[PDB]
Amino acid sequence: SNNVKPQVFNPDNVMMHEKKDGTLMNEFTTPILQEVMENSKIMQLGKYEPMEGTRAFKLGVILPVTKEFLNYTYSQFFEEMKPMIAEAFYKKFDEAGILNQGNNPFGKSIAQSIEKTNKVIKGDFTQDNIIDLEALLEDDELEANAFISKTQNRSLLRKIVDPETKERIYDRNSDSLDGLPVVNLKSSNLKRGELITGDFDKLIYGIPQLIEYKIDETAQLSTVKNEDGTPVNLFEQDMVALRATMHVALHIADDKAFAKLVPA
Amino acid sequence: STVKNEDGTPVNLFEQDMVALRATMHVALHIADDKAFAKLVPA
Amino acid sequence: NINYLFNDEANVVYTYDGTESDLLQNVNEVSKYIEHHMDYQRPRLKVLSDYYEGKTKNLVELTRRKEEYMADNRVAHDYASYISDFINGYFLGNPIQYQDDDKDVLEAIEAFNDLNDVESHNRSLGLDLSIYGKAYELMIRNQDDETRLYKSDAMSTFIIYDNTVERNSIAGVRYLRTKPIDKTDEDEVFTVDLFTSHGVYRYLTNRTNGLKLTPRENSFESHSFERMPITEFSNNERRKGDYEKVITLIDLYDNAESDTANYMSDLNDAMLLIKGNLNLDPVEVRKQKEANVLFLEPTVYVDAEGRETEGSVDGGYIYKQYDVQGTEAYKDRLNSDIHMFTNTPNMKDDNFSGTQSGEAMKYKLFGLEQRTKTKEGLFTKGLRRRAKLLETILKNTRSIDANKDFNTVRYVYNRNLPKSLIEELKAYIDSGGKISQTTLMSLFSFFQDPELEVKKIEEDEKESIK
Amino acid sequence: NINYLFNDEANVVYTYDGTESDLLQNVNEVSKYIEHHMDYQRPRLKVLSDYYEGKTKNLVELTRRKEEYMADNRVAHDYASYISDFINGYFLGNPIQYQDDDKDVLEAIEAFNDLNDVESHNRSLGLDLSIYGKAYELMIRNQDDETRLYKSDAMSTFIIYDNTVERNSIAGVRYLRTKPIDKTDEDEVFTVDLFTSHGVYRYLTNRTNGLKLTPRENSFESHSFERMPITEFSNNERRKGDYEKVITLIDLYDNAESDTANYMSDLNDAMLLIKGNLNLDPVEVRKQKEANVLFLEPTVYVDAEGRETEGSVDGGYIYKQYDVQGTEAYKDRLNSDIHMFTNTPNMKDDNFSGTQSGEAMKYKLFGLEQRTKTKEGLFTKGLRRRAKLLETILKNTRSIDANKDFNTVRYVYNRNLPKSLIEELKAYIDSGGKISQTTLMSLFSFFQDPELEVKKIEEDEKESIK
């Protein structure tokens, strides 16, 4: 466009070579992934279901980039970013299926299963409360398969020792509690003192369409307005965008197979 | 542009994840002699 | 160009830490390799191929051209083809010969070579080695139960090697765009064939879904070799092409020539320049081609006080000119360097030595011989693997005794230098050579019937007895 | 460039004062040597390799380039490859021959050479000698119980020598970065192999923690030699490469040629200059290419007192020009000096006599032979160590009698000069040589069946009896 000051976008999601203050990221050193890539927990715990068609829903995102940014600041951006989109989808799916958060489209979730069956234990972390949590499952002939926890509570788990064998019930190196593997959730919605468990073979998922990536240079982005309010034209403004889409489907075969421990 | 979203915005195929087929043809017609044709019509 | 040919991720060798089983159980890894190949290695190969076809940058980079009224005059010179065809013909224009101490193995080799037309195959490999720098061949047991050898295109094939210093080839892959010619819709579907030491796995993908491999019909198929069937050949230890290092000079020569073509097209060669205040009738100007005398009468200016003075009329031809010395010295330097750095004979600055060609060629191609001898070493290193595969399939079919060994075969190379049958006959028959009459006659084309002539000689030699 | 190639810390020889045990107990010292190698030696070797790959400074130094409307016209000339391939082909293009008085040792050597394809290996060493000025080889008893020889990359290998005047090799190290293709994460782990006279120690390290050597899976692995298996070859006493000393001239040539390419791209070849106060219709100017007469009519200025006077019109072609004489003399000098200091034949200023292409070649390559004769000495000095290792492993496996000695082997070197089979046959059969018919026929390619011809001659020779 004819604006010589950098283009203000609404929302400000477009990547730019020149900051609002006019700083130019020339000779810019490539970032590094100081944190490890996260992985989908319900895809780790749950049972895969061969599917076509069906109930699924579509995840998607579009990342717009200024072609000056794509030429001078960081040429390999799109290739380095595909892992990061896949992570964002995994976190969105996990948060919907487990915690019933993020405007989940399904009418099914572990949080709803637990809230329906009222299979909740009020209490602090103790060997007796861990056993009670497991017994809420074995009452209905179902045996716990794994634990889901906020990583920030290992400080509580290390303080529990079996008064018979006089040893730690929690193996901090194996990250397994009472012999069962504990998976960690990075999401902000699962609180410090909360722990979830169930026979995750009763949680079923499917993926009709794996992540699809298209890169385009001539679409219009009606969802992003120029400062003047006109929609962004990729070609006309010399800009590029990447579209990612995915389909996921979720089913819970037995909603009594999950139990939750929560602070009193 | 001829098809509008429920909110009235023009349909964008990329941003909406759509596909569209366009068919076109050029055709030309000429009557070489206007007198060469006749018609029978019911009274 | 530069950003594709000289990138660091292109031209690398793919390696894997695990065993064939560790790879095959986790087919997603192969998808990572395929994606990296498509995103980095293929562009380089496509550029090199485009140069072999002469679709040089100058033709496609229309972005900054002008055509509002002038001609485009964009130009491509085809040095890449000239170079690669010359170097390949010199290396494999003359068939490789085979020697062995055991005739059973030698005849099994010769039978396989004849069935597969190995001469032409070898030449096509040498050509791919010249343009892309690497080449692949696939060997398969056919439906008609014959051992067949087929070349595999470089732009669609690659091999994943064991990470150890030995670098055994763990697995090879081939992938192809499958399309109708009507080009209706999604071109981006690829068939993938993954070759392991025990069989072929077949998959489908598309670029869209991030290449997640799906089993095809007949998704597995056993093969009777005991090692991965695809073989790779290298032009040199870097696997670099022959003209790959002079593409920038080819570009510069294209640009300079198109520049001169513009200068020729757009400026008028000469014009009759006429100056001074005058009346020219555009109808009279048409006589310019046929007039002999040009008469220019200057305007007379009258001063208010009665003085008279004349305007300055003038006339003469003017013609366009350009720096011929400097432009030809520059374009000659580019041509000279393109030939020097590729050890190809510079035809523009050449003299035939005396009258006898072979030794003058061995002098002028001395620099090319030095590279070819290394290429020859790597080529034999590959042919030994082809032989290893052939012996394994022959033994598994018991078409030969399990006692035989193929590694004893000696591969003998001859260059395609010019030769002189007259001097060679004189050198062979002097020094004690012998030739059968029918053979000797077969060498000279003035004999219309090389066999009937023998009978016709017997008649004469018979009547000479009487 | 300069600060990396001619630095004092690069190209040094590492020595250690203590015994092998004094080093092996304090493996942190190996960390210090690895760190020094990474920070000083590897940069030099990377630059030399980039020049052999043609990625000269001119291609990568985009930092000060311009592209606001002009073309980039950056250029690389590949002299490094031309030089290195020529010099290596000359030295090792013709395989090294072996002589010995004992056929048992001679055949054990030849068996090992055949198994390892030593001809190609030697050529790749002579090439590394030509690029980096030094090269390494590692010998290992394979898992299949065979003696194997593998070249080790000069950028990832070095040796720590005994401090004494004898400079025995105390220990060798190899270190490689390990990654999958999809990761570019912080912990750039290097796997380290440390070779001592009794075995290999294996470690992991990363630069982040300070190259603290951590033991590894199967942390030690014995070998049956009795001396450190890695061998180093030197191009000359200084271990300097062949074009290392002319890289600055190669750079100057790159800059000069890209300068001329800028001059060509950015200035207009010629233009029609028109001066003076006039009316030019830009619609009429488009006829410039096809008009024959150019008429310039000067503006007439009228003075207030009635005087009249004419403006000064003018017209003519102008064309760009540059100092072709001085720039071509300078670029010719650079090319001449690059070839002179590398004893490589200057193809642009060359003439050949007659047809004895070997003899003028020995004249012109006389300067190159002087250096090669030294490199031949150091190469044999290395080959003797290779043989010492081979005899030791053969004896410890009792594949040969403990009585044998390998130092009697004589290594015979031949240069890759051109040869003339016709002249040589005449020189060999004159002076009393003898050749078997089948062999003599095998020398001449006009015989389509060199063996069938013998039977075909017997038939003729038989009917001649009647």
Side-chain angles (χ1 to χ4, degrees), chain C residues 8 68 166 237-238 265 268 272 274-275 301 333 337 353 359 362-363 370-371 381 419 436 439, chain D residues 53 55 85 150-151 253 286 289 291-292 294 310 314 328 332 350 354-355 357 416 419 453:
Chain C
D8 296 341
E68 55 162 292
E166 182 164 88
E237 199 213 60
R238 305 296 165 123
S265 165
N268 204 331
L272 172 61
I274 293 163
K275 302 178 185 177
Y301 300 107
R333 180 169 294 287
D337 284 357
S353 188
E359 299 308 311
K362 273 181 293 188
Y363 184 97
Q370 304 324 310
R371 287 186 177 156
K381 191 186 296 294
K419 286 193 183 192
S436 185
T439 298
Chain D
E53 292 187 11
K55 299 166 71 182
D85 304 321
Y150 294 117
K151 181 160 66 76
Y253 194 87
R286 314 310 173 123
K289 176 54 185 172
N292 298 318
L294 170 59
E310 297 179 326
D314 203 8
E328 292 296 313
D332 278 347
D350 194 16
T355 58
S357 303
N416 194 32
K419 295 195 182 195
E453 183 61 23

Side-chain angles (χ1 to χ4, degrees), chain C residues 2 6 8 14 17 32-33 36 64 68-69 165-166 237-238 240 245 248-249 252 259-260 263-278 280 285 288 301-304 307 311-312 318-323 325-327 329-330 333-334 336-337 340-341 343 353 356 359-360 362-363 366-367 369-371 373-374 377 381 384 407 419 421 424-425 427-428 431-439 443, chain D residues 49 52-53 55 59 67 69-70 73-79 81-82 85-86 89-90 93 117 120 123-124 131-132 142 150-151 178 181-182 253 257 260-261 263-264 269-270 272 286 288-298 300 305 307-308 310 313-315 317 319-322 324 328 331-332 335 339 347 350 352 354-355 357 361 364 416 418-420 422 429 437 440-441 444-447 453 456-457 460-461:
Chain C
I2 304 305
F6 301 105
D8 296 341
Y14 296 120
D17 303 69
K32 304 178 181 179
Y33 289 97
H36 184 282
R64 287 179 165 178
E68 55 162 292
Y69 63 86
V165 66
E166 182 164 88
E237 199 213 60
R238 305 296 165 123
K240 280 185 154 64
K245 299 182 188 180
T248 45
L249 302 183
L252 290 180
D259 221 349
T260 309
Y263 157 87
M264 293 301 295
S265 165
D266 301 354
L267 280 181
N268 204 331
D269 286 8
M271 297 188 294
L272 172 61
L273 172 67
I274 293 163
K275 302 178 185 177
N277 191 1
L278 285 174
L280 283 189
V285 165
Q288 172 278 135
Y301 300 107
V302 192
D303 194 356
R307 324 185 79 95
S312 294
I318 57 167
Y319 67 105
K320 76 178 182 189
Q321 184 163 23
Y322 77 103
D323 186 2
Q325 302 291 353
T327 56
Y330 166 67
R333 180 169 294 287
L334 289 174
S336 181
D337 284 357
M340 186 178 76
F341 298 126
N343 302 296
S353 188
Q356 287 162 286
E359 299 308 311
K362 273 181 293 188
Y363 184 97
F366 182 81
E369 178 58 24
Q370 304 324 310
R371 287 186 177 156
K373 192 56 176 178
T374 294
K381 191 186 296 294
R384 290 183 193 286
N407 282 75
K419 286 193 183 192
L421 181 141
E424 284 159 44
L425 266 172
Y428 169 79
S431 91
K434 286 185 179 180
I435 309 189
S436 185
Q437 290 292 326
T438 301
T439 298
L443 305 182
Chain D
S49 171
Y52 183 91
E53 292 187 11
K55 299 166 71 182
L59 286 183
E67 206 195 333
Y69 65 87
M70 60 285 295
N73 288 4
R74 49 187 164 163
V75 168
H77 286 90
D78 195 37
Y79 277 106
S81 196
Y82 174 79
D85 304 321
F86 185 108
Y90 174 79
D117 188 36
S120 310
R123 281 196 280 272
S124 75
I131 301 175
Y132 312 111
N142 212 7
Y150 294 117
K151 181 160 66 76
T178 177
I181 55 165
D182 62 4
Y253 194 87
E257 190 77 323
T260 310
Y263 156 86
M264 292 297 294
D269 281 7
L272 174 62
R286 314 310 173 123
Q288 173 278 137
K289 176 54 185 172
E290 64 181 57
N292 298 318
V293 181
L294 170 59
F295 175 66
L296 303 180
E297 184 193 321
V300 178
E305 74 179 29
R307 324 185 77 95
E308 285 182 299
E310 297 179 326
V313 293
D314 203 8
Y317 295 95
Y319 69 105
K320 75 178 182 190
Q321 183 166 23
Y322 78 102
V324 63
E328 292 296 313
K331 288 151 74 185
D332 278 347
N335 178 59
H339 285 144
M347 288 172 68
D350 194 16
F352 176 58
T355 58
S357 303
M361 283 293 283
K364 293 175 187 185
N416 194 32
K419 295 195 182 195
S420 181
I422 295 165
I429 297 188
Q437 289 292 326
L440 177 62
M441 290 177 182
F444 293 100
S445 61
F446 59 77
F447 285 108
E453 183 61 23
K456 207 170 180 175
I457 288 160
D460 172 28
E461 189 167 287

Side-chain angles (χ1 to χ4, degrees), chain D residues 279-440:
Chain D
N279 295 314
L280 281 187
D281 177 357
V283 180
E284 184 139 53
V285 166
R286 314 310 173 123
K287 288 186 292 183
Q288 173 278 137
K289 176 54 185 172
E290 64 181 57
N292 298 318
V293 181
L294 170 59
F295 175 66
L296 303 180
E297 184 193 321
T299 297
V300 178
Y301 300 105
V302 190
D303 194 357
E305 74 179 29
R307 324 185 77 95
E308 285 182 299
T309 187
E310 297 179 326
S312 294
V313 293
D314 203 8
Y317 295 95
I318 53 169
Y319 69 105
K320 75 178 182 190
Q321 183 166 23
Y322 78 102
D323 187 1
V324 63
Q325 301 293 352
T327 57
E328 292 296 313
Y330 164 66
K331 288 151 74 185
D332 278 347
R333 180 169 294 286
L334 287 173
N335 178 59
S336 180
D337 283 359
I338 288 165
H339 285 144
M340 186 175 74
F341 298 127
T342 59
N343 302 297
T344 295
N346 179 15
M347 288 172 68
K348 192 166 178 277
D349 306 323
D350 194 16
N351 298 283
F352 176 58
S353 173
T355 58
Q356 280 204 315
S357 303
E359 293 308 320
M361 283 293 283
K362 276 180 287 191
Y363 181 85
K364 293 175 187 185
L365 276 64
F366 183 82
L368 181 58
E369 178 57 23
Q370 304 325 310
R371 285 187 174 155
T372 300
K373 194 57 176 178
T374 293
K375 193 204 300 190
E376 178 187 298
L378 297 164
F379 207 90
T380 305
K381 189 187 296 294
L383 290 171
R384 290 182 194 285
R385 185 185 170 95
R386 185 195 289 174
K388 185 57 54 180
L389 286 168
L390 180 60
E391 71 156 324
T392 303
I393 188 66
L394 291 170
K395 286 174 178 176
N396 290 352
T397 56
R398 298 181 186 80
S399 300
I400 204 170
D401 296 7
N403 187 45
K404 302 303 189 177
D405 180 8
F406 278 52
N407 281 75
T408 57
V409 174
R410 293 180 286 275
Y411 303 88
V412 176
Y413 293 83
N414 297 287
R415 300 302 183 246
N416 194 32
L417 288 166
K419 295 195 182 195
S420 181
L421 181 142
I422 295 165
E423 274 160 278
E424 285 160 46
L425 271 172
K426 201 255 289 183
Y428 170 80
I429 297 188
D430 295 356
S431 91
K434 288 184 180 179
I435 311 188
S436 186
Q437 289 292 326
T438 304
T439 299
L440 177 62

